[model samples]
Target: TPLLELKDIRRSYPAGDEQVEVLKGISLDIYAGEMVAIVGASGSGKSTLMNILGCLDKATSGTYRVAGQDVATLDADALAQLRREHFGFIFQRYHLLSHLTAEQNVEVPAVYAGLERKQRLLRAQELLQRLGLEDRTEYYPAQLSGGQQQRVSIARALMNGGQVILADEPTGALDSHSGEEVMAILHQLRDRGHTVIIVTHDPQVAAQAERVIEIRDGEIVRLEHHHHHH
Candidate 1:
């Protein structure tokens, strides 16, 4: 079965007297272990789509099934649980707490997952090490470079057994080399059998994915497949 299926999903917002529709009957399916990119310009509703896909927001109409469960019907607590257990998110901004150490930031998700403090710490250490941030574990966000901070965010995303990794403009704030490194890690996640979906405006970034879904004006305008490797 596909990992996620969106059937005619729609999202609308209240704007003055009329309802402004953002996503108009969008449909798609994402399979396991696939690296997919959703690309669009600013204000194209790509972020809205990502929000829906990540379960951070609900659709106004249509069906969204994640691992065979209908997400639209899930209550708030259930949605929170779903997000906690199944999804990992990385943003353009690292979103690391300035007051927290790298390791502490990485352990946040594990804490939500009810992992013991010792286990969470160990997991954070292992993930940071895997991401080449072993020496920066005790460093604050301000002390690390943008790449290191992002690596910490990635580590945090993986702390809860990330079944699906959802990244929104993850490399937007990084240098070219750092962006490449972040993309490489995303590819690694896909290779490891995790479903990875990235929302990007950069065609170069989209080209790295196995498939690209291009959105325009809240609608999917094109879907392209790329077989090239990094």
Candidate 2:
């Protein structure tokens, strides 16, 4: 089975008396060890789709499955539990706690998973080392460069050994050089057999993926795969 699947997914929000439909319907499947990019202009439902895929929000109608579990019907606690165990999110802003050191921020998800403090610390250190942030592990977010801070965030996202990583404009906050650094790590994750999904509007970034899906007016309008004209 596919690592992740979405079938005719639709999402709408109640705007006072009228309903605003953000995603008309989206259907896609992603397999393990693949990198997929979702691209669109602002207000094109890319963010909404990202939230649904990450299990942070539910679609109004349709089906979504991640690692063999149905997401649409999961209860609040179940959804939270699922997220803790299966999904890793990387945001553009690198939402690390201001008061926490880099290592501590990386340990947050493991803490949520009820891991022992020692184990969490060990895993955090190991990840930071792999991501080339070992020396900065004790530094706070404010003390690290933008690139370094993003590396720390990626380490945190990997804390739970999640199957898929969802990144929403992860390089939007950095310069081209730093952005390339972040993208390299993302590609490395895919090489290590994790499904990596990125949402972005930059064509250059989208081109780096194995496959690209373009969203417009709440629907997928284009699907392209590298090395194939079809």
Candidate 3:
């Protein structure tokens, strides 16, 4: 079964007596364990599409299904539960809490999962260690470099096993070296049987994915399959 399916999804906003359409009847399917990139120029509705895919926003019309469940039928609480259990998100800006330590930041999702405090801390520490931040667990966001902060964000995203990983310009804030490292980690997630979707404008980043879907003028213009090398 497909991990996600969008059927004629559309989104529009009212702009002073005019309806401005952002996503115009997009239909797509994402399968399990696939590394897919959605690429487009700015204002091309890529971000809007990502938001809808992640369940962060509702589409104005049409249907979205995940694992054969109709997303449009989900209540607010159900939608929140689905997001908590099935989705992991990484953004261009590492959205870590400044007051929290790296370990604490990673533990936030676990806390939401109803994990005991000790278990959450242990899991956070283990993830940080796995990501090469063993000694930085106690450091706050301000004390860490941009790359390290992104790693912390990645750790947090994986706290719940990360069945599906949605990354939006995840490498936009990093240097080339750091960006490469992040992309490598994303591929690692795909290898581990997690569906990975990346929304990016960088052609190099799109090239790293096995498939790229190009969006323009609020619609998908092309879908290209590429043979990617490790």
Candidate 4:
């Protein structure tokens, strides 16, 4: 069974007296342990599609199933819970708490998972250590390099044990070297059986994915499965 299935997904926004459609009947399927990339130019509705997949926003209409739950029928609180339990998001900006140490930042999501403080801290430390940030776990985001900060962000995303990782231009803010490092880490996640879906405009970024899907004018223009690991 697919880990994610979007059937006839559509989203629109209010523009003056008319609705401006962003995504029109987009249907796609992603299996577990798959790495997929969504690429498009700015204003093509790819970003909007990302928001819908991440459950950060609802589509105006259509069926979007993540891990078997239909997003369209979920209540507000249920949607929030679904996102917290099923999705791990990585964004271009890193979005780390400036004052928190690397491990602490990673532990933030665990709080929502209902973990005890001690357990959250321990899990965060373990994740950072696994990601090769043991020595830097006490450092704040500002104290780390761009690649290191991104690694910390990735660690945070994995903190909740969510199976799906939704990344939006994760390397957009980094230089080439740092971006490569982030991509390597993402590949590592896929190797560890996490489903990854990244939204990016960079061909280099898209190349790292096991599958690439091109979105144009709110629709999937192309989707190809590349080398499969599992």
TM-score per candidate: 0.97, 0.96, 0.96, 0.95
lDDT of each: 0.92, 0.90, 0.92, 0.88
Give the per-residue lDDT digits (tens) of candidate 4, residues 12-91. Answer: 98888889999999999998887899999998899888888888888888899988888888898889888888789889
Summarize candidate 1's per-residue lDDT along 71-180 as a digit string, tens digits.
97888988988888789999999999999999999999888667799999999999999999989999999998999888999999998888899999999999999999
Report the C-alpha displacement of residue 218, candidate 4, in angstroms: 0.6
2 versus 4: better TM-score goes to? 2
lDDT of 1 at 135: 91
Across residues 1-230, which tens digit of lDDT does each residue of candidate 2 receive? 69888999999998898899999989999999988999999999999999999888889999999888998777898898988877898989999899999999999998867889999999999999999987888999888998999999899899998678999999999999999899988888988998889999997788889999999889999999864221
Error of 4 at 172 (Å): 1.3
Regions more than 4 Å wrong, model 4: 228-230
Indicate the residue-level lDDT of 130 in model 4. 88
Query: Which residue pairs in candidate 2 have backbone atoms (N, alpha carbon, C) closer than 3 angstroms, thus clashing?
Result: none
Model 3 spans with C-alpha error above 4 angstroms: 15-17
RMSD values for the candidates in order, in angstroms, are 1.1, 2.2, 1.2, 1.7
lDDT of 4 at 107: 93
